[PDB]
Design a protein around this nucleic acid. Sequence first.
DNA 1: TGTGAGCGCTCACAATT
DNA 2: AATTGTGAGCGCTCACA
Lengths: 328, 330
Amino acid sequence: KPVTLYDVAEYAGVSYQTVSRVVNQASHVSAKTREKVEAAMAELNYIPNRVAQQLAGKQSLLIGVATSSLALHAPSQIVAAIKSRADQLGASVVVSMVERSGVEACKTAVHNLLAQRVSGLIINYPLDDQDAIAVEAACTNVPALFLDVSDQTPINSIIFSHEDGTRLGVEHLVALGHQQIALLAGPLSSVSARLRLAGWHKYLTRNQIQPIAEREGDWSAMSGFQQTMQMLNEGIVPTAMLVANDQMALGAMRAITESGLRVGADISVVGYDDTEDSSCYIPPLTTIKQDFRLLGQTSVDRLLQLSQGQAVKGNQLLPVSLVKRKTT
Amino acid sequence: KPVTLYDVAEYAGVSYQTVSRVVNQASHVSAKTREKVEAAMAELNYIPNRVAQQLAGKQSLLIGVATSSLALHAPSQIVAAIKSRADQLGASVVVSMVERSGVEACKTAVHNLLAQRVSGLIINYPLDDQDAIAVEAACTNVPALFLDVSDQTPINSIIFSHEDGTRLGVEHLVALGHQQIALLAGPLSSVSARLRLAGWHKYLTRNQIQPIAEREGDWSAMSGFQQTMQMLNEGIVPTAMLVANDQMALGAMRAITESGLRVGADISVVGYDDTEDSSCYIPPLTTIKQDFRLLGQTSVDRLLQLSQGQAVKGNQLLPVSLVKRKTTLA
DNA sequence: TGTGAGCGCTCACAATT
DNA sequence: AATTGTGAGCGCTCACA
Ligand SMILES: C[C@H]1O[C@@H](Oc2ccccc2[N+](=O)[O-])[C@H](O)[C@@H](O)[C@H]1O
Ligand SMILES: C[C@H]1O[C@@H](Oc2ccccc2[N+](=O)[O-])[C@H](O)[C@@H](O)[C@H]1O
């Protein structure tokens, strides 16, 4: 049985409360008293049983996070910025990873997070409107913030402005004089993917352009490669491609190149994310920058505000920007 | 105040213990009684406060994980396979991410994980031998498994066989007839990086070869690009490069290509990891495969065995393999 | 500074029938 | 002999003293 707060009480000549104050950096200590207590716990290697502290009522803002597999780029980047910002605010973070596809899986995840009595949830998992509303409802009394829902979902959410991203992309290709444009989208089961797809159609339409092709990948470079290969093998050869993410763009670029065409000069390409690696593709990839650090930082700040009944309900849009490189 | 075990007690006509039995799938229930209780908690949307269950003494296997930033490839892949395998074993997982560089930071992380009374720790953070031994010592009574230490560290650990990876790389370049070989290593502050560096030197030496260059990156493709550019600008132009990871290899390939040289035909390249993207680099990257799923899966199984006083102490080496692609062709 | 109380549950028994 | 209750406590935080 690990050292208790009681064990330090006698090994310091004080009570369990005296030690408590010391541990909590409380106000009103016997000055030199704290010096003695700390030495007492130091020699016994005392580590406050957080499990007991929480139950006892210690107000510790504990953020829960239901997320897509961390094996995926953006999710990992986001959780990272979340834990980082939470540590910086003295907030704790427990995360439930959802691997199985489906709303039940996400609900299971929210269930456990709730069991750990989190003071708020951050759901970074693709959810259709009613499913999101359902999840939001299951969050018994605790606030929920969503990161993978449409801007049209009636719940608290933060997402990058797909409107701005897709416009930037389309307008860039247009200003370069492209008219034969193909679209490589993320998996349709992804809300974010769908939002980008919609964004492209919206702005391509406003420029009286109709994509000469439209395929669906799964976020992986291999899918980008295969999809762009099938497209080219069907004789459909555009002069520019808008791709849902940098990784698929990479695969597209491989297919283009292994076909005898020059990325840029023959078929321009635009990616999405502006991942670290994108600046070193052959040739450097023009892309839309999504500052994941900012999303994770903002997510935590926001979930805390909500937890404090602060009037900041709704949907928030994060800025993005065009990074001009050599693929266009 | 969320629904208590007490709330179900009267909303079912039983006591808190009766409900407890039903919740824990206990032995000796009133048969139909459990049928009633379950219905009672179902209608009240009851979710057992795990915090209270743990304190009360409920024996649950909770794995703690101190790790390098999840913003890095391998660590994120590893934590994912860890959480995945733990969920599959009905084990819970809490993870403390260490961002600040240093042993104190890692100790801080272990401190918190201990505060949550985990039944074991998985440290995936670069630790020199004495620092690792120190951390291991701080793990008051609970078993610790390390993933970023040397195979020579006297503690429980699991790492990929750098010996096999570097040999595979070196022997491959040699069989292709390369003699002018440059080395691009990961950051020296990384144990894993150093192990690979050592491995290359070891096997290059056994083939009577001396690298004509040896630079250090930081795992990022940009570092791979910059380092390989400085190297080429100094007039040092090898015929093959061994790179500590696929991302730096990417940067190297960019530098090689933007220099008028053909990756493969003029300067061969070998990476490390066999990341998903590596199969789609221009041209496809020959690399050393490190099965991160396997590492995370094995780590959990192993930490649990240790937790059960199973005699499996020491260091374990995981296999790796060479993935031949196009960067070492012609 | 001490004291009382409790957080939600698990134990260990006891207590029902 | 089945089933239920009862007592106690887990480690700490509160509220007071
Ligand atoms: C920043 C956005 O990134 C999307 O990121 C995704 C998700 C998985 C793999 C790659 C990408 N991507 O963009 O390249 C998320 O689905 C969305 O919920 C939001 O987190
Ligand atoms: C599988 C191995 O990967 C190494 O991975 C690293 C670590 C950070 C960024 C990239 C890589 N990498 O290999 O490309 C770890 O340092 C080592 O502890 C172990 O986890």
